[PDB]
Amino acid sequence: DLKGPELRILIVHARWNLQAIEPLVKGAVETMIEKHDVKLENIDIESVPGSWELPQGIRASIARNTYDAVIGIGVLIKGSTMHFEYISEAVVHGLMRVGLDSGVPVILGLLTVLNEEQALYRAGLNGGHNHGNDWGSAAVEMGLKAL
Amino acid sequence: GPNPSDLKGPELRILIVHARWNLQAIEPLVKGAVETMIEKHDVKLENIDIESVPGSWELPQGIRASIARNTYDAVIGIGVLIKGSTMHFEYISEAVVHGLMRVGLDSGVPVILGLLTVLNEEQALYRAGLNGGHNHGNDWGSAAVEMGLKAL
Amino acid sequence: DLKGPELRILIVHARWNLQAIEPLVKGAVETMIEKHDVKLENIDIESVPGSWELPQGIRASIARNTYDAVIGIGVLIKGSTMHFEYISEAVVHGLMRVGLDSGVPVILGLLTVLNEEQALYRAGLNGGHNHGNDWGSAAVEMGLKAL
Amino acid sequence: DLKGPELRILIVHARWNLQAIEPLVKGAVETMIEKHDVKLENIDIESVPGSWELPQGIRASIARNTYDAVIGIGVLIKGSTMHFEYISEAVVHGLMRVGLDSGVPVILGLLTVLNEEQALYRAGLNGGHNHGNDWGSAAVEMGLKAL
Amino acid sequence: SDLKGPELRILIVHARWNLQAIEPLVKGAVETMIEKHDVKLENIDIESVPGSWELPQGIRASIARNTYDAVIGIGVLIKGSTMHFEYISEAVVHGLMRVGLDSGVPVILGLLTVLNEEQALYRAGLNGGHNHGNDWGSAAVEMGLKALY
Ligand SMILES: O=C(O)CCc1nc2c(=O)[nH]c(=O)[nH]c2n(C[C@H](O)[C@H](O)[C@H](O)CO)c1=O
Ligand SMILES: O=C(O)CCc1nc2c(=O)[nH]c(=O)[nH]c2n(C[C@H](O)[C@H](O)[C@H](O)CO)c1=O
Ligand SMILES: O=C(O)CCc1nc2c(=O)[nH]c(=O)[nH]c2n(C[C@H](O)[C@H](O)[C@H](O)CO)c1=O
Ligand SMILES: O=C(O)CCc1nc2c(=O)[nH]c(=O)[nH]c2n(C[C@H](O)[C@H](O)[C@H](O)CO)c1=O
Ligand SMILES: O=C(O)CCc1nc2c(=O)[nH]c(=O)[nH]c2n(C[C@H](O)[C@H](O)[C@H](O)CO)c1=O
Secondary structure, eight states: OOOOTTOOEEEEEEOTTHHHHHHHHHHHHHHHHHHHOOOGGGEEEEEESSGGGHHHHHHHHHHHSOOSEEEEEEEEEOOSSSHHHHHHHHHHHHHHHHHHHHOOOEEEEEEEESSHHHHHHTBTOTTOOBHHHHHHHHHHHHHHTTO | OOOOOOOOOTTOOEEEEEOOTTHHHHHHHHHHHHHHHHHHHOOOGGGEEEEEOSSGGGHHHHHHHHHHHSOOSEEEEEEEEEOOSSSHHHHHHHHHHHHHHHHHHHHOOOEEEEEEEESSHHHHHHHBTOTTOOBHHHHHHHHHHHHHHHTO | OOOOTTOOEEEEEEOTTHHHHHHHHHHHHHHHHHHHOOOGGGEEEEEESSGGGHHHHHHHHHHHSOOSEEEEEEEEEOOSSSHHHHHHHHHHHHHHHHHHHHOOOEEEEEEEESSHHHHHHTBTOTTOOBHHHHHHHHHHHHHHHTO | OOOOTTOOEEEEEEOTTHHHHHHHHHHHHHHHHHHHOOOGGGEEEEEESSGGGHHHHHHHHHHHSOOSEEEEEEEEEOOSSSHHHHHHHHHHHHHHHHHHHHOOOEEEEEEEESSHHHHHHHBTOTTOOBHHHHHHHHHHHHHHHTO | OOOOOTTOOEEEEEEOTTHHHHHHHHHHHHHHHHHHHOOOGGGEEEEEESSGGGHHHHHHHHHHHSOOSEEEEEEEEEOOSSSHHHHHHHHHHHHHHHHHHHHOOOEEEEEEEESSHHHHHHHBTOTTOOBHHHHHHHHHHHHHHHHHO
C-alpha cells in the first residue's frame, strides 16, 4: 500500500476524443487520492490540443514547476491515412525522451486504438477496466522511488 | 474530433514554414491557419511570418534555421506527403515527423504538426477543406495560439 | 567461463505478467551466483510497474549507486490495439539510450511476444529454455569487459 | 529563379548501383551550374562505399571544409532479407541528424526502391524524370536561405 | 577500393550468436584487409560480445579506451517466432549509427538481418554465395583513410 501525501503530480491530457479522455483523467485522479492519499491540491491538470502537443506541453510545465511524476494522457484513433502510425510513433518516443532528459518519471497514458469502442472500453465503459487507475498508481510508485 | 480554445493572442509571433510539393493542397491549409489565427484569436497579420522550403524533408531544417534567427512563440510546419510506388513515402514521413518533434523539444518552441501523410491526392484535398471536408489548417492555427500562450 | 566476484549487478524488472517475470529473474540470479561467483549481496533487485517504466527506473538507479552491469526485464504481450507495437519500440530504444548515455552495459531481458505461452516457454516452462540464464552470463561478461 | 554563384556545395554519393547513381549526380551538377549559376569548382564530389556510410561521410567532410548545402545520394534496392528496411530507416534518420546537428542543409537524394527499374526511372532513364535535377535546385535554395 | 592502409588500426567487434555464420564473415573481412589493402595483422583488434544487442555498447566501450581508424560491427539476427527480431534489429542498427556519429569514428555495418540460417550462410560465402565480410573489410579501409585525409 504505497502512500504519497506529499507528492506533487502533473497530468497533461489532450482534448481530442474527450469522451474517452475524461473517464481516464478522473480514474487516475480518484485512484491517487482515494488509494494513495495524494492531496487534490497537489495535482495539476493541464491540457493541450492533441497528442502531438503532449511531449511539448509536459516539457514546458516541468521546466516551470517541480513535480514528482507526470502522466501524459491522449487518445489516437486509426483513421484513413498513415497519420495515426507516424504521430503515435513520434509521440511515444517524445514522451520517453522528456522523461529521460528531465529525470522526472513520465507515465504513459496514451491509447493507440483502431476504433472509438476500443478506447471507451479501456476507459472503463461498456464493461471494461479503467486504465487511468493503473496510471495513477504507477505515478505514485515512480514518484516515491525517485524520492 | 478536435476541441480548440477561445484564447486571444494579440502579442503572439507565429512562424509558418510550408513545403511546395502538392501546392494545391498546401495553399488552402496555410490560408485556413492564417485566417483562423487572425479572425478568431486576434493575432496580427504583421506578427505572422510565412516561409517555404522545397519539400517536406526540408521542413525540420527550415524551421530550425528560422527559430535560430528570429523569435517566435509557436511554429506550424506544413507539408503534404503522398504515397507513391516506392518506400520513399514511409521513410521520409517517419524521418520528418521525428525531426519536427526534435526541433520543438531542442528549442523549447512549440512546433505544430501540419503534415499530411496520405495515400492519394483526394485525401489531402479533403483535409484541406475541399470536396466537403474540414480544413485542418484551422485546427492548426488554434493549436499554435494555444501553445504559444501556454509557453507564457 | 568468466568469474566476477567483485561485480555489482542491478536488475530492474516490471510487474506485468509476473508468472513469466519471476522465473526469468530467478534464472538470471542463480546463473550469476552459481556459475560466475557473483555475490548475493552484490545484486540489487528493483521493480517498476510496467515495461514503460523500465528505462526510467534504470536511469534513476544508476545515477544513485554504481553498478557494473544492468539487466532490464519485462514481458510485453501483443493485445487488441497497437499499444504493443509502440511501447515495444520505445522501450527498446530507451534501454539502448540509457546504456549508451551512461557507459553502463544494459542487458536486454525484454520479451516481446504474441501470447502468454511464448513468454512462459522462454522463461523455462513447458520444455523451454530459461533465457534469464543467458542474460545473467551476458551481464557478467559485459561487466568485466567494461573493466 | 534563384542564382547562387558564391555557394559551395558538397555532394557525397555511395557506389552501390552505380548505373543509377551517375545519372543522378550528373543531373544535380548540371542543374546547379546551368540553372543556378553555381561554379563547377565550388562543387565538391566525394564518395563512400554504400548508403550506410553516407551520414558518416558527410559528417566528416562538413567538419573539415565549409559548405552551404550538402546532397546525400544513394540507391537502396530491396533484397531477400530485411536489410533493406533497417538500413533505409537508419540512414534516413542519420542524414536528418547530421543536418540538424551541424546546421548545414542536407538534401535527401536517397532512393529506396523495390527493384532496379524503379531506380533507373527516377534517374531519368526509360522515360522518367531525373530527380537529381530537383535535388540540385533544392540544395541551392536551402543554401541561400541559410544565407 | 584499390586503397592501401598499412598504418590503419581496425577494430572488429562481433557477437557470438550463430557462430557458424559469424566466423566466415570475420575471417573474410580480416583476410581482405590484409591481402588486398596491406593492413597489418597486429593492427587489427578482434573482440566479441554475447549478442547483437551488446554490439553498440561493446564498440562504444572499446573506442573510448583505444584509438581506431575504423570499426566493423558484425552480428547475425535471425527471425524467430516472436517480435524480438524486429525490435532488436531496429535498435541495434540505430545504435551503431549513433556510436559512429557521436565518436567521429567510422562504423561499418556487418549486421545480417535474415529470415533463416540459409540466408546468413549464403551471405557468409557458403553454398555458392559471396562473402560479405570481404566488402566490409574494404569499406573499413576506405573509411579509415578518408577520415584521416
Ligand atoms: O488520425 C490522424 O492523425 C488525423 C486526425 C487527428 N487525430 C488525433 C487523435 O486521434 N488523437 C489526438 O490526440 N490528436 C489527433 N490529432 C491532432 C494532433 O495531435 C495535433 O494536435 C495536430 O497535428 C496539430 O499539431 C489529429 O490531427
Ligand atoms: O514519394 C516520394 O517520396 C518521391 C517524390 C517526393 N514526394 C514529396 C511529397 O509527396 N511531399 C513533399 O513534401 N515532398 C516530396 N518530395 C521531396 C523531398 O521532401 C525532398 O525535397 C527531396 O528528397 C530533396 O531533399 C519528393 O521527392
Ligand atoms: O498491450 C498493451 O500495450 C496494453 C496493456 C499493457 N500491457 C503491458 C504489458 O503487456 N507488459 C508490460 O510490461 N506493461 C504493460 N502495460 C503497462 C505500461 O508498461 C505502463 O506501466 C503504463 O502504460 C503507464 O506508464 C500495459 O498497459
Ligand atoms: O539489401 C541489403 O541491404 C544488402 C546488400 C546491400 N545493398 C546496398 C544497396 O542496395 N544500396 C546501397 O547504397 N548500399 C548497399 N549495401 C551496403 C551498405 O550500405 C554498407 O556499405 C555495408 O552494410 C557495410 O557498412 C549493401 O550491403
Ligand atoms: O530472435 C530473437 O531476438 C530471440 C533470441 C535471440 N536471438 C539473437 C540472434 O538471432 N542474433 C543475435 O546476435 N543475438 C540474439 N539474441 C541475444 C541478444 O542480442 C542479447 O544478447 C540478449 O537480449 C541479452 O541482452 C537473442 O536473444
